[PDB]
Write an enzyme that holds these catalytic residues in place. Structure first.
Site, short mmCIF file in Angstrom:
data_model
loop_
_atom_site.label_atom_id
_atom_site.label_comp_id
_atom_site.label_asym_id
_atom_site.label_seq_id
_atom_site.Cartn_x
_atom_site.Cartn_y
_atom_site.Cartn_z
N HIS A 39 0.80 -1.22 0.00
CA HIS A 39 0.00 0.00 0.00
C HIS A 39 0.84 1.27 0.00
O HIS A 39 0.32 2.35 -0.32
CB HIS A 39 -0.94 -0.01 1.21
CG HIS A 39 -2.19 0.79 1.02
ND1 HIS A 39 -3.16 0.45 0.09
CD2 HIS A 39 -2.65 1.90 1.64
CE1 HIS A 39 -4.15 1.32 0.15
NE2 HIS A 39 -3.86 2.22 1.08
N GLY A 141 -0.67 5.94 10.94
CA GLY A 141 0.76 5.75 10.86
C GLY A 141 1.25 4.43 11.39
O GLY A 141 2.47 4.22 11.48
N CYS A 143 0.38 1.40 10.00
CA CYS A 143 0.47 0.41 8.93
C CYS A 143 1.88 -0.15 8.87
O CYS A 143 2.86 0.60 8.91
CB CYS A 143 0.08 1.07 7.60
SG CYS A 143 -0.23 -0.06 6.26
C1 7YY Z 1 -6.57 4.51 12.78
N1 7YY Z 1 -5.84 3.36 12.28
C2 7YY Z 1 -5.73 2.20 12.87
N2 7YY Z 1 -4.98 1.39 12.10
C3 7YY Z 1 -4.65 2.12 11.03
C4 7YY Z 1 -3.80 1.59 9.90
N3 7YY Z 1 -3.79 2.40 8.67
C5 7YY Z 1 -2.82 3.29 8.47
O1 7YY Z 1 -1.85 3.52 9.42
N4 7YY Z 1 -2.77 3.99 7.35
C6 7YY Z 1 -3.68 3.80 6.44
N5 7YY Z 1 -3.56 4.58 5.22
C7 7YY Z 1 -2.37 5.37 5.05
C8 7YY Z 1 -2.49 6.76 5.07
C9 7YY Z 1 -1.36 7.58 4.91
C10 7YY Z 1 -1.15 9.01 4.88
N6 7YY Z 1 0.14 9.18 4.70
C11 7YY Z 1 0.79 10.47 4.61
N7 7YY Z 1 0.76 8.01 4.61
C12 7YY Z 1 -0.11 7.00 4.73
C13 7YY Z 1 0.03 5.59 4.72
C14 7YY Z 1 -1.09 4.78 4.88
CL1 7YY Z 1 -0.89 3.00 4.85
N8 7YY Z 1 -4.64 2.92 6.60
C15 7YY Z 1 -5.64 2.73 5.56
C16 7YY Z 1 -5.33 1.51 4.68
C17 7YY Z 1 -4.09 0.86 4.74
C18 7YY Z 1 -3.86 -0.24 3.93
F1 7YY Z 1 -2.66 -0.91 3.96
C19 7YY Z 1 -4.85 -0.68 3.06
F2 7YY Z 1 -4.62 -1.76 2.26
C20 7YY Z 1 -6.07 -0.03 3.00
C21 7YY Z 1 -6.30 1.06 3.81
F3 7YY Z 1 -7.50 1.70 3.76
C22 7YY Z 1 -4.70 2.22 7.73
O2 7YY Z 1 -5.58 1.45 7.87
N9 7YY Z 1 -5.17 3.32 11.12
#
Ligand code: 7YY
Ligand code: 7YY
Lengths: 299, 299
Positions: A39, A141, A143
């Site tokens: 991702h 953050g 992931c």
């Molecule tokens: C609240 N929460 C609980 N667990 C998570 C995990 N999570 C995450 O940390 N980040 C995600 N999206 C990103 C956004 C970004 C913005 N910047 C600047 N960089 C980013 C990197 C990521 Cl990965 N997501 C969403 C998500 C991550 C995936 F790997 C996926 F396959 C589908 C998804 F919808 C996320 O869930 N957040």
């Protein structure tokens, strides 16, 4: 009884940050390879319906920023395996532990090292639910944070965090990039399947009670495994597998209570309740301690 | 929302084993000093009623075997500070983190690294209770395990584990060797004072429940601080101070629920019970999260 994580030091020394444009997450540095969710190659516009094969062809080694702290690790190769990206880097991690990649079954527990921007933040025990989600504690953050067990200095990595579901539980992959459960790595609304109670772990909790002298619920009945499974399903309990019966072996031997006799005691508790009585000082049956967890805390 | 410990790696690299005769426990190796419970100098006969100054004068440096992993460190000096023995060794620990020694107040939480024979075994969060005991998970051989908090790379050591009371709760010292509570380092049955509940922590955890979407316990009633404190004292809850109210400020701001409105909610919970319902999956009122713990994990 409380939830106890493994010491996290051997995993802390493997956490790095991986950035692609502005998309940033955590990765796992073992020997000269960094493992992270694919991702990371998504721009904001790609996250809903990513074409990962298409997004990777645009990418070259010099598009990946990998950092241990503020130290850059130069990427010299990149490939995609299922839902994980493998970045070959030019430095072998001197802190690499003895390790394995394992795919765990539902009910099994593991320690989660929650990380943000490559920096470890906290550690806690989680169980894999039978709908293949975990009830974690994750912020943005996170992931790429990993889950693991440690046996005799060897770290078995079993989980890499990808996403939060609408219901607030969490979904991810093993370290070969294969999702647990029927999820895909897109920012689309995906529903957890209906959860069930983890029968093998409730049985472990009952053995834990017996070990500590709390054994009023032991009745004089027995059951077959097929008869028990059919009854358990009517109370939203998971059917037991042959592997479940066998991992209860050590606790059954320690207490002298046959597995099927304990299943009969559990069946009685499901059909009639607890009547204001407690088990291990609790009116709720606990289902997130494995048989191994129970022996860890009792002996 | 989960009980979350600090990553333990910075502490793991400081755990060693200390042995005097057949008596053995864990020690903390920082720079060229190993800190450990002075109980290590007792034989089984001494443990019942030890005169520690008399016991220590009869020991020489070579009576102390210290092992870091498989490496034996040579003791070149020894002294006693209250209940803590300080062994000077001929080698500085190269993994020594930036650290401080602090004495914590009741209600504050810390991470415990449970250790056996100098080897870290598990990590979990604990709170210092009002009667200066902690509800830990410790078995035989855990003496000398430490508790700590981590603040931007600096480890603040606050607890050194000594003993288990007959009720199953745990007692220990700070790293200057002074016990928390009215206990002494002797093998005799010891009871604690009455265990008052940490009210500000229960309120923080109710705010955590709201932030995580659970609101069934909220109500429209109102209460003054003194009227809440009257009910609290009746139920062996710690009186809430204006300082506690101030500390809950950020959580009330985030939720729009006034602190005294949450007190009204807690007052009803104390008077009526939970009616079989649960909060954050718990059937009882959780008091081992501080306001900072809730803030840090929810944000
Ligand atoms: C609240 N929460 C609980 N667990 C998570 C995990 N999570 C995450 O940390 N980040 C995600 N999206 C990103 C956004 C970004 C913005 N910047 C600047 N960089 C980013 C990197 C990521 Cl990965 N997501 C969403 C998500 C991550 C995936 F790997 C996926 F396959 C589908 C998804 F919808 C996320 O869930 N957040
Ligand atoms: C069940 N449990 C929970 N926490 C603890 C901690 N604990 C401990 O690990 N050991 C103790 N006594 C020792 C016996 C030894 C036998 N050998 C061969 N070596 C030994 C070393 C120790 Cl420290 N105790 C008891 C105890 C320890 C003290 F430091 C003290 F001041 C009074 C006490 F009664 C113990 O509680 N066990």
């Amino acid at each position: 009884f409380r939830k106890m994580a493994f010491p996290s030091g051997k995993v802390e020394g493997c956490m790095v940050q991986v950035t692609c444009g502005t998309t940033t997450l955590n990765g796992l540095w073992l020997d000269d390879v960094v493992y992270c969710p694919r991702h990371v190659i998504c721009t904001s516009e790609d996250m809903l319906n990513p074409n990962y094969e298409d997004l990777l062809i645009r990418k070259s080694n010099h598009n990946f920023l990998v950092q241990a702290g503020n130290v850059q690790l130069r990427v010299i190769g990149h490939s995609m395996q299922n839902c994980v990206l493998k970045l070959k880097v030019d430095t072998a991690n001197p802190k690499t532990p003895k390790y394995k990649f394992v795919r765990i079954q539902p009910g099994q527990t593991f320690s989660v090292l929650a990380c943000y921007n490559g920096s470890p933040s906290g550690v806690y025990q989680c169980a894999m639910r039978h709908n293949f989600t975990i009830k974690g504690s994750f912020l943005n953050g996170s992931c790429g944070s990993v889950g693991f067990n440690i046996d005799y200095d060897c770290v078995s990595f079993c989980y890499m965090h990808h996403m939060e579901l609408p219901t607030g539980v969490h979904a991810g992959t093993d370290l070969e990039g294969n999702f647990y459960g029927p999820f895909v790595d897109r920012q689309t609304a995906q529903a957890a399947g209906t959860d069930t109670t983890i029968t093998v772990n409730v049985l472990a909790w009952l053995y834990a009670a017996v070990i500590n002298g709390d054994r009023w619920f032991l009745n004089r009945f027995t059951t077959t495994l097929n008869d028990f499974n059919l009854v358990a399903m009517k109370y939203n309990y998971e059917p037991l597998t042959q592997d479940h019966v066998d991992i209860l072996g050590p606790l059954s031997a320690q207490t002298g209570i046959a597995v099927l006799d304990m299943c009969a005691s559990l069946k009685e508790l499901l059909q009639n309740g607890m009547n204001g009585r407690t088990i291990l000082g609790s009116a709720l049956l606990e289902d997130e301690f494995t048989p191994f967890d129970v022996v860890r805390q009792c002996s």
